Curated annotation (Swiss-Prot):
Matches recorded under Gene3D superfamilies: Green fluorescent protein
Keyword Phosphoprotein appears in the UniProt entry: no
Application notes: Green fluorescent protein has been engineered to produce a vast number of variously colored mutants, fusion proteins, and biosensors. Further generation of mutants led to more stable proteins (at 37 degrees Celsius for example) with brighter fluorescence and longer fluorescence lifetimes.
Organism: Aequorea victoria
Family: Belongs to the GFP family.
Result, substituting residue 136 to E: In mut1.27; shifts fluorescence lifetime from 3.03 to 2.85 ns
Effect of residue 195 to Q: In R10-3; matures to the red-emitting state with excitation and emission maxima at 555 and 585 nm, respectively
Keywords, sorted A to Z: Chromophore, Luminescence, Photoprotein
Reported effect, residue 178 to A: In Cerulean; leads to improved quantum yield, a higher extinction coefficient and is 2.5-fold brighter than ECFP
Effect of residue 181 to D: In Cerulean; leads to improved quantum yield, a higher extinction coefficient and is 2.5-fold brighter than ECFP
Descriptive protein name: Green fluorescent protein
Consequence of changing residue 208 to G: In GFPA; leads to enhanced fluorescence at 37 degrees Celsius. In Venus; leads to yellow fluorescence, improved maturation and reduced environmental sensitivity
Effect of residue 204 to V: In EBFP1.2; shifts the excitation and emission spectra to shorter wavelengths and increases quantum yields compared to BFP
Length: 406
């Protein structure tokens, strides 16, 4: 009847007290994450030296490539030189361009919250691809991109299979050039990373085009937080050239890369019932003294500075006290340390004064009195008798859970 209203008012007040106790740590965690996802981009404000190492095996042709150069994310510019250290490449240099550093993309200011790549640094990320050459074979690559000292290093393994002996790749029919492409990026929340896809068009000497379908996943190497982007794309342009002083099989690569492409009315009255237990003098604001009274009435004993720390997190407008909108906000906040259960379990422990697993009538009477929820002895007995299913005259946790989620 009127009895779950009395349980609910007490439960919300206790929950609000538990949220006051927890709010400073929640806010620290949130600010710490924002600070941590923002540090990686600071590593890219100037020119960054780059090393690249690849070991490859295409149709049983094994080879290795070494690259060096530098990247400048302020301009979205990469300049690299690659040398085949095992002789001549068994595949055309242009088929390896995508495999040979997306942390150097220029992200415009209003998009900087969508730059996964830099946010993963310096610990770095793994980049995995399958590249399907239409009517031909496929590459599978795995790359670790990370800082080693002040140098950004890209270490790559590549495996190619099913290529045709006389196709465009093993027959070396690709022109030594490159076209512009858009690289489409979306968040992969399950893996704390991104999923990427694009199609490369390689010019063939006879005027046709060889398509190369790219599928890509990037996952952070470290355990820290990363930026998970909204859907967007990177605009890529690439130019291939040769070093006229260079005898070994090699490629000079220039890339330019820029990102683009981006309650209940009764609940309010319930909350107001809980708010009045804090606002002892009914003036509509909770002071540190009132909050301290509530905390002590619930078995805590915070210092004046702890109380101030608590009010400071919730005092959104800064007048030094807490009003109902500010109280409302705190209760609407979704916490990163709760399921449905944990709020209920924390509240049950306040009611169960001695922590023996059962709320007795004497305990309920005592906490109600301490909170100032004005109830007679008979009304407390009614609340117990209503929640009590097994008839022991006390409320265990399971009985409490049933009542609160009813
Ligand atoms: Ca007050
Ligand atoms: Ca205020
Ligand atoms: Ca007890
Ligand atoms: Ca019982």
């Amino acid at each position: 009847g009127p009895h779950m209203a009395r349980w609910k008012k007490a439960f919300i007040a206790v929950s609000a007290a538990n949220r006051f106790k927890k709010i400073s740590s929640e806010e620290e965690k949130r600010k710490r994450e924002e600070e941590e996802v923002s540090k990686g981009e600071e590593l890219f404000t100037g020119v960054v030296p780059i090393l690249v190492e690849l070991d490859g095996d295409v149709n049983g042709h094994k080879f290795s490539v070494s690259g060096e150069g530098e990247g400048d994310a302020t301009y979205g510019k990469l300049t690299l030189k690659f040398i085949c250290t095992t002789g001549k490449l068994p595949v055309p240099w242009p088929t390896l361009v995508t495999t040979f550093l997306q942390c150097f993309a220029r992200y415009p200011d209003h998009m900087k919250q969508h730059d996964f790549f830099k946010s993963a640094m310096p610990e770095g990320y793994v980049q995995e691809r399958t590249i399907f050459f239409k009517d031909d074979g496929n590459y599978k690559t795995r790359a670790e991109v990370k800082f080693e000292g002040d140098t950004l290093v890209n270490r790559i393994e590549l495996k190619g299979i099913d290529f045709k002996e006389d196709g465009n790749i093993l027959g070396h029919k690709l022109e030594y050039n490159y076209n512009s492409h858009n690289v489409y990026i979306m968040a992969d929340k399950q893996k704390n990373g991104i999923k990427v896809n694009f199609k490369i068009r390689h010019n063939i000497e006879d005027g046709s085009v060889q398509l190369a379908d790219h599928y890509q996943q990037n996952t952070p190497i470290g355990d820290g937080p990363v930026l998970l982007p909204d859907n967007h794309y990177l605009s890529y342009q690439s130019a291939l050239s040769k070093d006229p002083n260079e005898k070994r099989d090699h490629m000079v690569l220039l890339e330019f890369v820029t990102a683009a492409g981006i309650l209940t009315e009764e609940q309010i009255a319930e909350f107001k019932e809980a708010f009045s237990l804090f606002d002892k003098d009914g003036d509509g604001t909770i002071t540190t003294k009132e909050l301290g009274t509530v905390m002590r009435s619930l078995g805590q004993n915070p210092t004046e500075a702890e109380l101030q720390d608590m009010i400071n997190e919730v005092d959104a407008d800064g007048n030094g006290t807490i009003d109902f909108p500010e109280f409302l906000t705190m209760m609407a906040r979704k916490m990163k340390d709760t399921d449905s259960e944990e709020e209920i379990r924390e509240a049950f422990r306040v009611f169960d004064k001695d922590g023996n697993g059962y709320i007795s009538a004497a305990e309920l009477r005592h906490v109600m009195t301490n909170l100032g929820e004005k109830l007679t002895d008979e009304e407390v007995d009614e609340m117990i008798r209503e929640a009590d299913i097994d008839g022991d005259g006390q409320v265990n946790y399971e009985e409490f859970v049933q009542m609160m989620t009813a």
